[PDB]
Structure 1
Amino acid sequence: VRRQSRPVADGMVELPFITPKPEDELLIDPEKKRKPGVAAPQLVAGDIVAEQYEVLGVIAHGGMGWIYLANDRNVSGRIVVLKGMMAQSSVQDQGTAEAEREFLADITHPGIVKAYNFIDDPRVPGGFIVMEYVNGPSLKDRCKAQPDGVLRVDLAIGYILELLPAMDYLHQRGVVYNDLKPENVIATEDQVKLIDLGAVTGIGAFGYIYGTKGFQAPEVATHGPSISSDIFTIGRTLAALTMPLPVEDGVLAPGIPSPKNSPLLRRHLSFYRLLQRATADDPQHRFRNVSELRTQLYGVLREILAVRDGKQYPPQHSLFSPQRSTFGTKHLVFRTDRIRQARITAPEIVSALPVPLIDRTDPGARMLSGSSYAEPSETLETLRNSMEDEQYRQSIEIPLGVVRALLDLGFTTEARQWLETLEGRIGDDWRHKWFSGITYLLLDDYATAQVFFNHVLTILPGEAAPKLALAAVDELILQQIGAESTAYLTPDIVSATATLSKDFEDLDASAFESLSDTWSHISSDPHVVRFHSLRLYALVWATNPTTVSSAFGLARQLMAENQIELAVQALDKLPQSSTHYRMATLTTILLLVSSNLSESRIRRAARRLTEIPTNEPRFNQIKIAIMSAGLSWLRERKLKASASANPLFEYPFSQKGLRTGISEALRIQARS
C-alpha cells in the first residue's frame, strides 16, 4: 500500500512516505571502501546459522561488527537481521539471564523492531540477536541526504513525536531504550521504528550501559539508567537532527549551543529552552516522562510554524486556561481624555493572564470545581476544612486553591506567607512558582516576579502564558524607571527582533553582548529587559492573534525604540472582526504623532483619522493631538509652513493656520 505524505502533530507537520528499497538492492559490497582495521565478514551467502537462518550477505558494519541479512527458514519469505549482541555478566543467576532475553523477545509494539532469537555461531564469537529487517533509511541517512546535513526543525519534531509512543511503551513496562540516536531510528513507508533492541535494559540496572558518548546522560555511568536518562537522549537526538553540533574526535560536544552561535536557536528560542530542559545536567531538572515532553513539543512546534511560515493554530494542549481579559489596550488612547498619569497596573495584568488548568489526578480536584463562581471567603473556608483531612495531606490543588482565594480577597501578604509555608513540600511544582510570580507581581516586587515567571517558562517552554507574564513584568520594570520613551537598542536589532525574521539570524553575536550565553531573562539591565519584553510580545502576537494584549505591548516597546513604522504595522494586523479593532485604529493614529515627528507621519495620521466616522467620541481630541503635533513639529524645525499647500484637515499646515485650527477645535471640545 504505497501512499502519500501523512499528517502528524494535529496536522501541523507532514511526514514523507519513504519507498522501501527493492529487496535485490539491500546488500552492500564488503570490499567497497574497506575501512582501516575492519576484517572481512566471517559468513557469506549460503552459510546456515543455527540451522535456521540462511545468510545472504551484509547490509552494514557497525560497533558490534558486520550486520548480516538472512532468510528465516521457518517463515517462508521472511528476511531477518543477524546483529552482534552484548554478552551479560557471566556471573549472574542463570534464570535471571534467560529471563532478561525472553523479555526482549516478548516486547510487542509497532514502533519497535521485533526480536526473534538469540543464537551463538562458532564462526562469529560474541553471539547474535536475530531481529526483524526494517527496510528504510535511518534518520542519520535522511540528514546526510540534505545539503546542510540537518533536517528541517518541524520535520525533526514530527519524527520525535512519532517515536514517543514506543519510548513510553518501554517506560511503562519498567525498561528503557538507552541508546536513542539518529542511526537506530528508521523511517520506513509511513512509520517510524526503533531498531536497537539489544540495548534495552531495566530501569536502574547494574552493568555497563551500552549508550553512546555524546548522547548518554552524565549520571548513567554511576547511577544506572532511568526514564530521565532516556529523556536526555531524546533531547540530544533532537539536537543532532536539527543543527551541526560541534564534534570532538567523533564525539558530540556536551551541552546545547548558545543562541549567539546558532541561527536556528536564535530564531526559535522556545526550541532552545526545550532542548535545555530535556538535556539538563541534573535529572531533577528534566522532563519527568515522555508525555510531559510531548505537551511542550506541541507548543514549541506552534511557535516554530508561526515564526517561520506565519501559520497560526489554536492551542490544543496548553496547561493554562485561555486569556481571561485584556490589559493595556486603552492605555495610549485614554491619555487624550480631557476631564495625573495613566499607567499599566499589576492587578490589570493579573486579571488578564490565564490560570493553570486543574489537575484531574489530584485528590482534591473535586473540591475546586466551582471555586471561580463561588464567593472567595466561602471558598477559603471550605478549602481550609478540607486540609483537616488526612486524605488531602499531599494535595497540591487544595493548598494553591487557598492561595487564589487569598489573592481574590486582596490578602496578598497572607498569600505570600502561605506560599512560603508550602515551599518545602511543593516548591518545585511549576504551579507554586506561577502563583509566587502572581503574588509578588501584585506586591509590585517586579524583580522577584521576573524570577518566578522565568522558572515557569524554563519548565514549560511551549506555553504562551509565562511569556506574556514575563513580557508584562519587563514592561512594568521599564515603566517603574520611566523608560517608555527611552531607546536602548540599535534600529537593526529592533527591526530584526520585532519581525522574528531571517534578519534576526543575520546579526552577529556581538549584537547580543549584554545577554548571557543562554539569553537569561533574569536581569535588571534596561537593555536586556527591553530586548526581552520586545521579543516576547512579538512571539506571543505572531503565535496567538487573539492575545491582543501582546499586540499593544509590542507597539509600546517599538514606540520606545522610535520604530513607529513597525509599531503601526504590528497593530494593523489586528483584524476588523475583533472588538478591539476601533481601539487599534485610534492607537495607530496616536502612535504616528507620539514621538519623532515628521510631516509624513503627521499627514498620515490626519488622513487615517479622516477615515474614521465623526461618530467616534474621541474624534475631536485625536484631531487636536494631531494638529498640536504639526504645530510642535513646525516650531521645532523653525518652519513657517510645510512645503505643500495641501491643508492639514481643513486648515493650512502653517504655524498661523494650525494655531487657528487648534483654537477652533478646543472651543468645540470645551462646549461639549
Structure 2
Amino acid sequence: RAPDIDPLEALMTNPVVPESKRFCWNCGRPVGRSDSETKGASEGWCPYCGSPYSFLPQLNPGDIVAGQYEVKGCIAHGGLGWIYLALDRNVNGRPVVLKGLVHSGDAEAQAMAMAERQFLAEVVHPSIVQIFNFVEHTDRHGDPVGYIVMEYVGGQSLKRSKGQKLPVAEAIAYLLEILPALSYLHSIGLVYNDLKPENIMLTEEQLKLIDLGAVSRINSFGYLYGTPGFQAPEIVRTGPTVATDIYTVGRTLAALTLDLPTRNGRYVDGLPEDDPVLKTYDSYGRLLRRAIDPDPRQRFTTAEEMSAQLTGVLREVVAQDT
C-alpha cells in the first residue's frame, strides 16, 4: 500500500532560526549568538540598542486566529519575523499566509498599523499577491499583535546568485509580465517601492509580486526604507514616485542578468564597465542605463513607456541570440 501524505508538511520549515541568521530588527546587529562564554538566547534584548527580539514562532500549529485561520506552521522567517501557513475557514479551508505588521508596539500601535495598510485589500491585479484580511492575535507573551492575511503563492523567488544569472531574454520576458502590475499601481496613485528579485515569485503558471510592505502613495515620505543597490538615490528628496519605481526596474533587470560587483554585501551603483552581457546586447545596456539614470527626469516617464521600449529590446535580443 502507497501512503497518504499531507502535502502541507513538505511546504513548511522547522520553526527555528539558525544563529547565523539572527539580527536585531532595530539596529541590524547580530543578536542571540553563542560565544566562547554563553549560549545564545532565542529571545531577549539587543545588547546595543535595547530593542526586544524573539526568534520563536508567535503562532503555533492548531492556533485559531480571529476564529477564521487555523495555523499549520511556518513557511519562512524574514525581517518582520515568521511567515505562517494557515487554513481559511471562510474560503473552503484554502491554505493562506499570515505575516506580522510591526516589529514591536502596544495595542494602539498594532491597531494603527492594521488600519494604514487596509487599502491593500482593494489592490486587485493577477500579478500582485492578494491581501484578504488584517487580523489581531496575542503573541507568545500575551500582548496583542497584528497580522496581514494573504494568498499562498507557489514556487520560489527570482533571486539568483553569481553562478545562476538569468539569460537576458528570460529576464526581459519576466519584467514585461511585471511592468503592467506597476502601471496598474501607478494608475491608482500607488508605488510598489520594493521591486527586487527576492520579491518576485515564479510559479508553475505566472510571476507574482509579494511583500506589499513598502507599497505607498506617490510623493509620500512616511516610508523611505529600501535596499542599497535597488533604491533610487533621490528618494529622500522626492519620496516614492513613478521615477523611483522605474529605477528599481533597471536595478532588478541588472541584478537578474549581470555579475554586478558587490561591496559590503550590496550591489554597487551604476553598471560595471566592459561587462560581457552589456557589450553583447547594446539596446539592453542602453535601456538599463536610462532606467537607472541619477536624474529621475531622464528615466522612462511611465511604466507603459518602459514596457514599449523593453518589448523592442526583447525582439533585438531574440534576433541576436540566433
TM normalised by structure 1 equals 0.39
Pick one of 264, 267, 277 that aligns with 2:280.
267
Asked whether 1:29 is paired with 2:14, we answer yes
Structure 1 residues 24 and 87: CA distance shift in structure 2, 3 A? closer
Deviations, residues 307-352 of structure 1 (Å, cap 9, x unaligned): 222xxxxxxxxxxxxxxxxxxxxxxxxxxxxxxxxxxxxxxxxxxx
Describe how 1:448-467 pairs up with structure 2 within 5 A: none
CA distance in 2: counterparts of 1:127 and 1:291, whole angstroms: 36
1:128 has 2:147 as partner:
yes
1:35 counterpart SS class: helix
Residue 290 of structure 2, aligned match among 277, 296, 301? 277
Letter matched to residue 107 of structure 1: V
Q: Give, in whole Å, the separation in 2 of the partners of 1:173 and 1:96.
A: 23
The residue type equivalent to 1:263 in the other structure is: P
Between the aligned partners of 1:164 and 1:237, the Cα distance in structure 2 is 12
SS state at 1:271 partner: helix
CA contact 2:290–2:300 (8 Å) conserved in 1: yes
- 1:215 matched to 2:230: yes
Aligned with residue 59 of structure 2, among 43, 65, 72:
43
Alpha-carbon distance in 2 for matches of 1:226, 1:96:
24
Per mean C-alpha deviation after superposition, the further-off stretch among 48-57 and 265-274 is: 48-57
User: Quick one: distance in 1 between partners of 2:113 and 2:201?
Assistant: 29
Is the 1:55–1:68 Cα contact (8 Å) retained in structure 2?
yes
1:206 Cα shift? 2.6
Aligned with 2:20: secondary structure?
coil
Q: Is the 1:72–1:78 Cα contact (8 Å) retained in structure 2?
A: yes
Counterpart check, 1:230 vs 2:230: no
Deviations 1:598-645 (A, max 9, x none): xxxxxxxxxxxxxxxxxxxxxxxxxxxxxxxxxxxxxxxxxxxxxxxx
- Is the CA contact 1:83–1:128 (under 8 Å) kept in the aligned structure 2? yes
Contact 2:114 2:134 in 1 (8 A): no
- In the alignment, which residue of structure 1 is the partner of 2:178? 163
The 8 Å contact of residues 214 and 251 in structure 1, kept in 2 or not, is answered as yes
For 2:105 and 2:184, the matched residues in 1 are separated by: 26
Indicate how the Cα distance of structure 1 residues 268 and 55 shifts in structure 2: closer, same or farther if over 3 A, else same. Answer: same
Amino acid at match of 1:115: I
Counterpart residue type for residue 157 of structure 2: S
1:167 deviates by: 0.9
- Between structure 1 and structure 2, the one with the greater Rg is 1
- 1:301 and 2:303 aligned: no
Task: Supply the AA of the counterpart residue of 1:265.
Answer: L
Question: Do the aligned partners of 1:86 and 1:198 also contact (CA within 8 Å) in 2?
Answer: no
Aligned twin of 1:114: 130
Shift of 1:119: 2.4
Pick the aligned partner of 1:190 from 205, 210, 215.
205
Q: Is the 8 A contact 1:149 1:244 kept in 2?
A: no
Q: Report what 1:486 is aligned to.
A: none
User: Cα gap change, 1:277/1:219 in structure 2, threshold over 3 Å: closer, same or farther?
Assistant: same
Alignment of 1:367-446 (within 5 A): none
The secondary structure found in structure 2 opposite 1:83 is strand
Residue type matched to 2:11 in 1?
L
1:278 Cα offset (Å): 0.5
Deviation at 1:213, TM superposition (A): 2.2
Q: CA deviation at 1:255?
A: 1.1
Q: Shift of the alpha carbon at 1:96? A: 9.7
Code of the aligned partner of 2:199: N
> Do 1:50 and 1:119's aligned partners in 2 also have CA atoms closer than 8 Å?
yes
Per-residue deviation, residues 34-66 of structure 1 (Å, max 9, x unmatched)? 534362323221122233221111111111111
Query: After superposition, where does 1:612-623 map in structure 2 within 5 Å?
Result: none
The answer to whether the 8 Å contact 1:178/1:209 transfers is no
Is the strand fraction higher in 1 or 2? 2
Whichever residue aligns with residue 81 of structure 1, its letter is V
For residues 216 and 61 of structure 2, what CA distance do their matches in structure 1 show?
A: 33
User: Structure 1 residues 96 and 148, CA, compared in 2 at 3 Å: closer, same or farther?
Assistant: closer
Describe the SS at the equivalent of 1:228. helix
Secondary structure of 2:175's counterpart equals helix
Does the CA-based 8 Å contact 2:127-2:208 persist in structure 1?
yes
Aligned to 2:11, the other structure's residue is in SS state coil
Higher helix share: 1
- Equivalent position of 1:78 in the other structure: 94
Structure 2 residue identity aligned to 1:42: Q
- Tell me how far apart the structure 1 counterparts of residues 77 and 94 of structure 2 sit (CA, whole Å): 22
SS at match of 1:119: strand
Secondary structure of 1:25's aligned partner? helix
Code of the aligned partner of 1:252: Y
Task: Write the distance in 2 (CA, Å) between the matches of 1:163 and 1:89.
Answer: 34
Report the TM-score, using the length of structure 2 for normalisation. Answer: 0.79
- Could you tell me how far 1:97 is from its partner in structure 2? 7.5
Distance 1:86 1:238, change over 3 A: farther
Give the aligned CA root-mean-square deviation in angstroms.
2.5
Q: CA deviation at 1:101?
A: 2.8
Alpha-carbon contact 1:129-1:198 (below 8 Å) kept? no
Partner of 1:327: none
CA distance in structure 2 between the aligned counterparts of 1:96 and 1:128, rounded to whole angstroms:
12
Letter aligned with residue 35 of structure 1? S
The structure whose RCO (Cα within 8 Å, separation 6+) is larger is: 2
**Matched residues in 2 for 1:122 and 1:184: separation?**
28
Where do residues 218-617 of structure 1 align in structure 2 (5 Å cutoff)? 218-258=233-273, 260=274, 262-309=275-322
Following superposition, the deviation at residue 304 of structure 1 comes to 1.4
Partner of 1:79, secondary structure, is strand
Amino acid at match of 1:71: L
Structure 1 residues 88 and 207, CA, compared in 2 at 3 Å: closer, same or farther? farther
Deviation of 1:294 after TM superposition, in Å, equals 1.0
Distance 1:86 1:184 in 2: 19
Q: Output the CA distance in 2 between the equivalents of 1:191 and 1:96.
A: 34
Q: Is contact 1:167–1:177 with CA below 8 Å preserved after alignment? A: yes
Secondary structure of the corresponding residue to residue 130 of structure 1: strand
- Residue of structure 1 equivalent to 2:50: none
What is the deviation of 1:112?
Answer: 0.8
- Residue 267 (structure 1) shift: 0.8
Aligned length: 278
1:58 and 2:77 are equivalent in the alignment: no
Contact 1:82–1:129 (8 Å) recurs in 2: yes
Q: CA deviation at 1:221?
A: 2.2
For residue 67 of structure 1, give the secondary structure of its aligned residue in structure 2: strand
Q: Which blocks of at least 5 consecutive residues in structure 2 are unaligned?
A: 1-6, 24-54
Percent identity between matched residues is 54
Structure 1 gap segments, 5+ residues each:
1-21, 310-672
